[PDB]
Paper text:
In this TRC, nsP3 has been for a long time the least understood nsP, but recent studies revealed some of its functions in viral replication. nsP3 is organised into three domains: a [name] (MD) at the N-terminal, a zinc-binding domain (ZBD) and a C-terminal hypervariable region (HVR). Macro domains can recognize ADP-ribose ([name]), poly-ADP-ribose (PAR) in their free or protein-bound form, or O-acetyl-ADP-ribose (OAADPr). In order to better understand this mechanism, we initiated a structure-based study of the [name] (GETV) [name], which shows a peculiar substitution for one of the most conserved residues in the catalytic loop, namely serine replacing a glycine in position 30. We produced the GETV [name] for crystallographic studies, alone or in complex with ADP-ribose, and documented several conformations adopted by ADP-ribose in the binding site.
The interactions between GETV [name] and the adenine moiety, the proximal ribose and the phosphate groups of ADP-ribose are specular to the interactions observed in all the GETV [name]/ADP-ribose complexes described so far. Lastly, co-crystallization of GETV [name] with low concentrations of ADP-ribose and aspartic acid (3 mM each) led to a structure where the distal ribose is covalently attached to [name].
Residue numbers in the entry: -1 to 160
């Protein structure tokens, strides 16, 4: 049985070479400022019926891509403990979609680290919940980010796991 693998890329997630992509979504399924701007531009039909509650994920095949809309919590709107539970739940929802649909690779941004961060640095919080959830899969996971300081912190965390 294959073990999951983790890499990090500092690049626009819309250019990924994986079988599926995770959109860091909002619950209403709206295309707004965030990862979803790039996902909507690349796969413009992938948002139809995408609305899904916080802490859940919803998949669509559209425009030749598998898009997984995962709704992390907005840390401005929940307590820290409640958001930590919901963030873990959103990544377990992604992992369940990966395993049940036999998806072999996935491009993933860090949920709740931008628009939904409550103005805090949540890179390691979000990454550690990504590892816990995606460890239940056999997928090749590629984490996407824009920030050089994030890219280093993510690679360091991946390296430790070895
Ligand atoms: C629309 O669905 C929109 O994405 C949502 O309403 C929110 O923006 C989601 O908020 P969240 O905090 O979960 O994530 P977001 O700020 O969108 O992005 C997470 C993380 O990813 C980096 N980022 C943003 N855009 C990209 C692209 N195109 N490629 C790689 N990485 C990207 C941000 O820096 C952010 O930290």
């Amino acid at each position: 049985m294959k073990a999951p693998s983790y890499r990090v890329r500092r690049a626009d997630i819309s250019g990924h070479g994986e079988e599926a992509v995770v959109n860091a979504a909002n619950a209403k399924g709206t295309v707004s400022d965030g990862v979803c701007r790039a996902v909507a531009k690349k796969w413009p039909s992938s948002f139809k019926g995408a609305a899904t509650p916080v802490g859940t994920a919803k998949m669509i095949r559209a425009d030749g891509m598998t898009v997984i809309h995962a709704v992390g919590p907005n840390f401005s709107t929940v307590t820290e403990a409640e958001g930590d539970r919901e963030l873990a739940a959103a990544y377990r929802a992604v992992a369940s979609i990966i395993s049940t649909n036999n998806i072999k690779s996935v491009a993933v941004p860090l949920l709740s680290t931008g628009t939904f961060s409550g103005g805090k640095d949540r890179v390691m919080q979000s990454l550690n919940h990504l590892f816990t959830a995606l460890d239940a899969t056999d997928a090749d996971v590629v984490i996407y980010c824009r920030d050089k300081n994030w890219e280093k912190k993510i690679q360091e965390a991946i390296d430790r796991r070895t």
